[PDB]
Paper text:
Using soluble chitin derivatives as oligoglycosyl donor and oligosaccharides derived from chitin and β-1,3-glucan as acceptors, A. fumigatus Crh enzymes act as transglycosylases for formation of chitin–chitin and chitin–glucan crosslinks both in vitro and in vivo. AfCrh5 adopts the GH16 family β-jelly-roll fold composed of two stacked seven-stranded β-sheets with a convex and a concave face. In AfCrh5, Glu119 and Glu123 are predicted to act as the nucleophile and the general acid/base, respectively.
Apo crystals were obtained using ammonium sulphate as a precipitant and diffracted to 2.25 Å. Finally, a truncated form of AfCrh5 (residues 22–275, excluding the signal peptide, the Ser/Thr-rich region and GPI-anchor sequences) was expressed as a fusion protein featuring an N-terminal PreScission cleavable GST-tag followed by a His-tag.
Author numbering: 24 to 266
The structure:
Amino acid sequence: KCNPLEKTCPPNKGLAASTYTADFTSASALDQWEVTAGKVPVGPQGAEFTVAKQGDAPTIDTDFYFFFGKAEVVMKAAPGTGVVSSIVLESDDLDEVDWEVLGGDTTQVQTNYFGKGDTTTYDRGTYVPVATPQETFHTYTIDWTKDAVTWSIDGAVVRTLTYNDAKGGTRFPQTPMRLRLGSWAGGDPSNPKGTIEWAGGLTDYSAGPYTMYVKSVRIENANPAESYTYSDNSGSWQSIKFD
């Protein structure tokens, strides 16, 4: 939560490899992850993100950050009105690329991005058709280069954000990012009306529980390093130092 746009921050721990793969069949697979809220059991269908009662927001974050490359997640989304299933790439300056599935919307996934925590417009969000994301696994793939972010589902391109498209590159995600996986109630009664409407309605916890499943993760790090340092206030990929 230390923002390098505002302060000098300690370095991000790096994925010092070109490839990271986790089959979530195994208890082992959570080695390089932090269960950063709730409890995330690892059954035969992989890591389980259950929303059972209000305040349930089970999440895992990678210990490491990667700097360009690829994030591929095999996920079956949680069902249920207002239950959100989230795949997030996020940097310490709040550059961000994500997938959002809504439990009651059985025909789409939302694609999204933020540059530097800037939520000013809503040119960031696009819905794409997907067959029953709550009832079947899909492969959600983000290809991330200095030229473009590409979203793919089951190896079909569904969205491309070019560097120029993201306010002339000023809002292009281009700082080292970690992968966050989680489910949560967008339709929590305590949420803003706008979040509940976006989530597709009020969440009924008693009609639960609602479980998102992640069976595997593949990360390709374009720039393997032990760590990344933001050398200035630019938030530019050019400002990122690593050995």
